[PDB]
Amino acid sequence: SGFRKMAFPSGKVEGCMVQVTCGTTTLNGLWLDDVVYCPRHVINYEDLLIRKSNHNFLVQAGNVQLRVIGHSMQNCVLKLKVDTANPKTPKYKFVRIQPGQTFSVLACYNGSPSGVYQCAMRPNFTIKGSFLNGSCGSVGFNIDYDCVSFCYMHHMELPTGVHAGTDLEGNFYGPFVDRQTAQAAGTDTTITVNVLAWLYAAVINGDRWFLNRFTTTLNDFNLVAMKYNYEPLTQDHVDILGPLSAQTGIAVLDMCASLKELLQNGMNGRTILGSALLEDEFTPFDVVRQCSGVTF
Amino acid sequence: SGFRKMAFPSGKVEGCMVQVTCGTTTLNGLWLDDVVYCPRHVICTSEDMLNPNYEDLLIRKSNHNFLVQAGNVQLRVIGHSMQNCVLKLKVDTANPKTPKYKFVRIQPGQTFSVLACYNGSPSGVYQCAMRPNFTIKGSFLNGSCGSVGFNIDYDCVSFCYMHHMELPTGVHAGTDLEGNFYGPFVDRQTAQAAGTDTTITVNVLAWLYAAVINGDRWFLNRFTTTLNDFNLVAMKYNYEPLTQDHVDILGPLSAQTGIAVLDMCASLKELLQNGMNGRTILGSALLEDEFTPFDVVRQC
Ligand SMILES: NC(=O)c1ccc2cncc(NC(=O)Cc3cccc(Cl)c3)c2c1
Ligand SMILES: [Cl-]
């Protein structure tokens, strides 16, 4: 029993964190095999990069200085070729995630990991993280068996306190650019399929006060979701929720009628899994994994 | 900016998790140097759990009855001893991945990270607090016994909790790494219940200071309070009494924000009276009590 916001064990990623210094700027890098990946803003980026030599980039792995022997740019990520392969390199892939998907973040400062938290890629492509100055280059990831799938690298904080970054191939999530200019996060929405998954997790843990005898059509629910700044629920989301529906005996559209009643009438002084708000940062897969105990 | 429930990086603890099997029971052990620490209830059957005599059960065991597995390697047990509710299995190999560590006993209100494990394999990490009633509101399934709680301040891992059992309300009970339980609990399947829980007042105050540091002041008011009047009101909402030690501990956050502790106590009194009125504080519609004054200073 119990339901916590749970991150993946961070050990496989900790063994990859390094410090990258270029001039006055110090940030974090990801050392995989013989390449160190970091935000290109550590340095017209092609014009700024052509003026740099390998010895201008100082890379520190623990108390050891790594020698940079090459450098190249891929989108908004700088790739520093080093003379030593990371002996701690885990099995890994670079994957691009979609809004609504969750991942763990290993927040780092000076190439030293300080904390790990779980979060979701918001529908507006920002993340509600917890980062201070020096956190740039911190990474987001998921784990599948023994394979680490790197999905995010931190680049900047927006004026509202939310965060923006890229996949590990340097492509930004969202309409952001890596420079000091007027940029704002778009109006955010609630991840509907995730709220539904969290309602199924509450039923599994013995919280059934919000259940009702009613059902709804997907069209009627989507009109209600549009009214309350909730993302549209598609047939794919309904299919994905299938296992949780079979486990609890509550049809997905039956759980939508509960969500509709919660949106129109509130919680009435009650909580669900210790929360007075509807939680949207647990995917259907996170709920099944936390209520089954899958290990890495 | 931002404020998240943040756990310590778990790598130093992952390299210590092993699987301990005794007969039909399989649970987790903590491998530090040449000793594997695990709940002594690994020697029990489900029947034995009503009134186990651990000394009588342990004397019937030999070293080869305990199967210890570290990854794909079987460790050889060369000795065994019991210390309170923890079993200490001497093994023939020192853990090469043993970090710098200490065993510390924490007090209610203190927070720590938990590395939840099954079959000696880590599955997840979360942050939690030792409740005033000595239970933890964890997320643990069958097989999670032996999972550990820790803090990593600087490069030293301070182990403070080992998971032993789930109570009927879904909350969890365990021991420090010397095998002494937190709370009036016993490793017996006897009728045991968590005492009435309360809110950790010093932690809610710390979290209100974190909100002010992140730019939010909507909840502040022009009033102050005496410590006694604050306690008379807060105890009516099931809040723990605030002591002079708590007021002293909040000193740095008071100096940073310019809001005296007893003025912050007056905003807390008002929040309990009024509720939030559709507003949130650091993305929460409830008053959060699982961040200590130390966690707020560390994260903000
Ligand atoms: N499904 C379960 O059996 C279950 C679920 C969540 C569980 C979460 N934590 C622990 C489990 N087990 C026990 O508490 C074992 C036990 C029993 C009595 C006395 C002691 Cl000291 C130990 C858990 C089991
Ligand atoms: Cl303590």
From Swiss-Prot, chain A:
Where does the record place the catalytic residues?
A: 41, 136
Name recorded for this polypeptide? 3C-like proteinase nsp5
Q: Which residues form the Peptidase C30 domain?
A: 1-296
Q: Which residues lie on this side of the membrane: Cytoplasmic?
A: 1-296
Q: What is this protein's gene name?
A: rep
Q: Where in the cell is it found?
A: Host cytoplasm; Host Golgi apparatus; Host nucleus
Q: Which residues of the full protein are shown?
A: 3264 to 3568 of 7096
Residues involved in crosslink (Glycyl lysine isopeptide (Lys-Gly) (interchain with G-Cter in ubiquitin))?
5, 81
Q: Which organism is it from?
A: Severe acute respiratory syndrome coronavirus 2
Protein activity control: Inhibited by pyridone-containing alpha-ketoamides compounds 13a and 13b. In turn, alpha-ketoamide 13b (tert-butyl (1-((S)-1-(((S)-4-(benzylamino)-3,4-dioxo-1-((S)-2-oxopyrrolidin-3-yl)butan-2-yl)amino)-3-cyclopropyl-1-oxopropan-2-yl)-2-oxo-1,2-dihydropyridin-3-yl)carbamate) inhibits SARS-CoV-2 replication in human lung cells. Inhibited ex vivo by michael acceptor inhibitor N3. Inhibited ex vivo by compound 11a and 11b.
Impact noted for substituting residue 196 to V: In strain: Zeta/P.2
Q: What does this protein do?
A: Cleaves the C-terminus of replicase polyprotein at 11 sites. Recognizes substrates containing the core sequence [ILMVF]-Q-|-[SGACN]. Cleaves and inactivates human TRMT1, preventing tRNA guanine(26)-dimethylation of tRNAs. May cleave human NLRP1 in lung epithelial cells, thereby activating the NLRP1 inflammasome pathway. May cleave human GSDMD, triggering alternative GSDME-mediated epithelial cell death upon activation of the NLRP1 inflammasome, which may enhance the release interleukins 1B, 6, 16 and 18. Also able to bind an ADP-ribose-1''-phosphate (ADRP).
- Which reaction is the catalytic activity of this chain? TSAVLQ-|-SGFRK-NH2 and SGVTFQ-|-GKFKK the two peptides corresponding to the two self-cleavage sites of the SARS 3C-like proteinase are the two most reactive peptide substrates. The enzyme exhibits a strong preference for substrates containing Gln at P1 position and Leu at P2 position
Assembly: 3CL-PRO exists as monomer and homodimer. Only the homodimer shows catalytic activity. Interacts with host FBXO22; this interaction promotes the proteasomal degradation of nsp5.
Residue ranges the record marks as coiled coil: none
Highest taxon above the source species: Viruses
